[PDB]
Write a protein that binds this DNA or RNA. Structure first.
Ligand code: CA
Ligand code: CA
Ligand code: CA
Lengths: 412, 480, 51
DNA sequence: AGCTCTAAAACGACGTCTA
DNA sequence: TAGACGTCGTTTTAGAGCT
RNA sequence: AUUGUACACGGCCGAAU
DNA sequence: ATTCGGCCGTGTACAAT
């Protein structure tokens, strides 16, 4: 004759599921006994890193449904109505009380503070289906309920499991060989007109100490008089790139910069006065947009603004570093200004300061991702034409043990 | 690239109380070194308008100042007042007879001078005489506050001379700094001096910028200004507000920061140093000294013997307090350590028997950075090990503050240890991050630079106007 | 039971600071404040001073 | 299609009829 | 006097209801 | 100069041609 | 002249998304 209806089993299952979610987050959950009234359990916070309980408790009331839409449910949000006595009991307590709704059909949990009532209504809670999901990602927000924002000096450690951040370094895959040789000239400044005189011209070479260093074969192009043809040799790149000599390092960096300049000449253009790779404008007073993958999104590299007229081009002070016998390219986002798209805009301090001041972390991350995508794509041939000499690969994404509680800072 | 995030270093206040924020730590436990006597006699120099104006601000801070931004209560806390939660456990009183008034005729005398350099030097002589009178008498102030009037600020700082810039007609370069010159010329006086503009103690008063004449200067909220100003006043009174909480098992270490500054002519380059170590007890000693050498030049680095004498002085100064040479000597420099420098440091240590040393070049001009996903930068204390070079994020998102107190994406420090280094980069970054929280010139605890590096540059400003061979006080209270 | 219940009474206020203190007397001024419009119109009438 | 009471289950003792 | 039957208290979800 | 950051501008230095 | 490295100094904008 004894019966345990599916309603009680479903409620116990919902409580167990919420406890499991809380334990997955990293907190502690205590279930109240028979004498519970208006509070299904207590959540105690715990530091994910140190494992030390934080001693801050919050009550939890769990309501479970097998299926069925909530009040005014849609794709983006829904609504819930509280009992008046339950709300009064929650308000006369001394700890924050949250309510979690658990739907078994789709296995979803949505949490909200019982005091976060809809404007003008005491007992209505408007659950946002995008931000009110009960899961580890919400942990920080839950912790935000424990502390009183009014009293000073109270805080909470970051309660998220971790985060992922990228670096601006791009790993370079150097060619297995390097063309080293002698030369009539000790400095390339005098040699450049000699190369201009000959047939084929390309600026992917370095003259440092009467020695000629290049990635491409000097014989196959117009760089003939620049180099003694008899002494031309191709040697393993480990004898030029990965060594300890200072001038070898300087020549390697200069050659890498010139190779990147030539390889990315389709989209970029170099400014020697500031060593700045800025997106060249196609046509005077004609604009350009760039599409990159991060999910494909367009960043608008070149912008004019009306008035007297100034053109902002995205730019980067691409530099080179050698760490752990590997070569990395460092991307430093910046902006360049031109009067008509080609002639540099004199007096750009005001525009530069205005553009930099309003730039936050997200914008800089977007810019560096766009530059990384551009330099990665420029290293692909996809054949007729010589394959690009330098190929850049994104570094493995950096893992951080702690995360910024950004989700709890939407209204500081 | 293995990344690490350091938890905020622990600070020590009051009767051994610990907190991670100087403002909240002072409110709960009080200053680390309690003051004998409940009154801090503050002397004020300025016009009768500013002297009376600053006097009520000190009383106003005693009553209590509300928070300037209730949304972020940790970043902009209210000044408690004179109750149980008094940050410094003492009253900032201006005792009777401890005020000196700059007459309107005296101000007109300084303003009337045409050349900016001559006006500054004449003003320094005028204020120095008033400072001498203040300390000669029975006033006996603990710290002297110079409440500069608005007309004086325009001439001394903004170089306003009746509309036309006669000094700019001379086309001189590197106009004299009134503050740096004034501090140098009053080093012989026994009382530290503090310069205060009317903007801090009066929201109504506005001071225009030097170049942007239309625009006024923008200042923090009044509560934040009181927190930073009174903490400096308390420190200049002679008591350390807070100290890094020391680990029970750590090597007795002294941090030495090395910096450089120009020689008032824009060409030569001297070296200024700062030494930081514990006081064998609850205290923390921060000294600022100049190299005794005379090897003039433009190189932003030390030589062989000159670097050796710098360490010898630092060891001797440490030995004067602990009566034993330090176990570890951490040297922080603003420029890359060279072979001549490192062998100079090693020679001094060999003559003294120091076991462990670390030679770290703190670099801010590094293009390397990391970016998380979101509208906020990485957490403060984030560290990336870039093959023996430490990428330390001394500035960034602060969970305690609930935001990031900056203007753009923060620029990280790059710690480049020399080959002749003992500690691993992970421990060096942890020490450098801790040193940023012990800069007493402000109560906000997220400073980009470590204290020895920060203190070295501050010492260079004052010592730029001090003639070589003149013995000056090494106490950092005279420079901050 | 009564002693235990007194622990949760929270005698301490929720971190509120009260600026004012003991006060003797108050008064008001005959002075009154004026708000002004954000626009004025000027011209040069063919008359001298409105006579 | 929302609320709101209303059913349906369980446990916890405790009067109240109902003999 | 015993002894179910009942009322009272709670949770628990879900339905027929008035709207 | 309550406080520091970011940005802009300027000066200068070290190694080899 | 270049190419690679770096450093110190004086101003404005802003109080932090
Ligand atoms: Ca329950
Ligand atoms: Ca429940
Ligand atoms: Ca100061």
């Amino acid at each position: 004759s004894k019966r345990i209806t599916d309603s009680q089993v479903l409620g116990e299952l919902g409580e167990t599921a919420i406890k499991k979610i809380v334990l997955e987050t990293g907190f502690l959950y205590e279930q109240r006994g028979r004498l519970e009234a208006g509070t299904d359990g207590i959540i105690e916070l715990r530091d994910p890193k140190s494992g030390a309980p934080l001693g801050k408790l919050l009550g939890v009331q769990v309501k479970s449904t097998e299926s069925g839409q909530y009040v005014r449910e849609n794709d983006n949000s829904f609504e819930y109505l509280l009992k008046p006595d339950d709300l009064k009991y929650w308000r006369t307590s001394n700890i924050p009380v949250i309510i979690v709704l658990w739907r078994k059909s789709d296995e979803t949990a949505y949490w909200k503070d019982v005091s976060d009532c809809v404007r003008g209504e005491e007992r209505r809670l408007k659950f946002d289906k995008g931000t009110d999901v009960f899961d580890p990602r919400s942990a920080d927000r839950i912790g935000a309920l424990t502390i009183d924002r009014r009293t000073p000096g109270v805080f909470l450690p970051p309660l998220n499991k971790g985060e992922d951040a990228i670096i601006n370094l791009l790993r370079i895959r150097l060619p297995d060989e390097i063309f080293i040789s002698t030369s009539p000239f000790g400095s390339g400044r005098d040699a450049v007109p000699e190369l201009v005189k000959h047939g084929n011209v390309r600026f992917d070479w370095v003259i440092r100490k009467r020695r000629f260093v290049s990635f491409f074969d000097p014989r196959e192009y117009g760089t003939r008089a620049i180099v003694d043809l008899d002494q031309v040799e191709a040697v393993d790149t480990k004898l030029i790139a990965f060594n300890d000599e200072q001038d070898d390092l300087n020549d390697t960096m200069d050659l890498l910069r010139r190779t990147v300049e030539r390889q990315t000449a389709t989209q970029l253009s170099f400014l020697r006065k500031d060593r700045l790779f800025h997106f060249k404008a196609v046509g005077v007073g004609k604009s350009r947009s760039y599409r990159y993958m991060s999910k494909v999104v367009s960043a608008y590299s070149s912008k004019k603004k009306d008035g007297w007229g100034y053109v902002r081009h995205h730019a980067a002070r691409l530099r080179f570093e050698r760490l752990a016998d590997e070569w990395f390219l460092v991307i430093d986002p910046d902006f360049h200004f031109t009067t008509d798209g080609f002639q540099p805009h004199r007096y750009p301090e005001a525009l530069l300061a205005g553009k930099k001041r309003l730039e936050r972390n997200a914008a800089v991350r977007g810019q560096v991702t766009m530059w990384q995508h551009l330099l990665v794509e420029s290293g692909k041939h996809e054949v007729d034409k010589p394959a690009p000499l330098l190929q850049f690969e994104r570094l493995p994404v950096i893992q951080l043990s702690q995360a910024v509680p950004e989700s709890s800072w939407n209204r500081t | 690239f293995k990344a690490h995030v350091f938890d905020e270093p622990m600070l020590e206040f009051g009767d051994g109380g610990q907190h991670c924020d100087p403002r909240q730590g002072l409110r709960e436990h009080g200053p680390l070194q309690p003051r004998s006597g409940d009154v801090i006699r503050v002397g004020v120099i300025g016009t009768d308008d500013t002297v009376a104006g600053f006097t009520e601000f000190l009383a106003e801070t005693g009553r209590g100042i509300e928070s300037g931004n209730k949304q972020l209560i940790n970043l902009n806390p209210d000044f408690p007042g004179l109750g149980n939660q008094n940050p410094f456990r003492c009253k900032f009183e201006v005792p009777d007879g401890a005020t000196v008034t700059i007459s309107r005729r005296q101000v007109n005398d300084i303003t009337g001078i045409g050349r900016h350099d001559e006006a500054v030097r004449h003003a320094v002589e005028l204020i120095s005489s008033q400072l001498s009178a203040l300390v000669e008498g029975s006033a006996k102030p603990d710290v002297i506050v110079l409440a500069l009037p608005i007309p004086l600020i325009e001439k001394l700082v903004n170089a306003k001379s009746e509309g036309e810039d006669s000094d700019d007609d001379v086309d001189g370069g590197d106009m004299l700094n009134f503050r740096d010159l004034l501090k140098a010329k009053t080093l012989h006086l026994p009382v530290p001096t503090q310069i205060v503009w009317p903007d801090t103690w009066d929201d109504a008063a506005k001071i225009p910028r030097k170049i942007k004449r239309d625009s006024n200067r923008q200042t923090q909220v009044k509560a934040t200004r009181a927190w930073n100003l009174l903490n400096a006043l308390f420190y200049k009174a002679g008591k350390v507000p807070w100290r890094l909480l020391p680990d029970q098992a750590e090597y007795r270490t002294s941090f030495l920061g090395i910096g450089f500054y120009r020689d008032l002519d824009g060409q030569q380059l001297w070296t200024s140093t700062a030494q930081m170590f514990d006081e064998r007890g609850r205290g923390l000693i921060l000294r600022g000294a100049r190299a005794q050498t005379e090897t003039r030049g433009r190189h932003p680095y030390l030589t062989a013997k000159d670097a050796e004498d710098l360490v010898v002085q630092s060891i001797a100064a440490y030995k004067a307090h602990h009566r034993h040479v330090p176990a570890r000597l951490v040297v922080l420099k603003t420029s890359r350590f060279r072979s001549e420098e490192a062998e100079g440091i090693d020679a001094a240590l060999g003559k003294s028997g120091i076991e462990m040393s670390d030679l770290v070049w703190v670099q801010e001009s590094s293009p390397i950075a990391i970016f998380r996903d979101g509208n906020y930068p990485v957490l403060r204390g984030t560290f990336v090990d870039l093959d023996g070079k430490g990428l330390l994020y001394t500035r960034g998102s602060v969970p305690f503050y609930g935001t990031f107190p900056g203007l753009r994406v923060p620029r990280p420090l790059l710690l480049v240890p020399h080959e002749n280094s003992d500690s691993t980069i992970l421990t060096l970054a942890k020490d450098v991050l801790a040193l940023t929280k012990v800069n007493w010139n402000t109560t906000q605890f997220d400073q980009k630079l470590p204290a020895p590096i920060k203190a070295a540059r501050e010492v260079g400003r004052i010592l730029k106007h001090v003639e070589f061979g003149t013995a000056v006080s090494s106490d950092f209270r005279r420079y901050t």
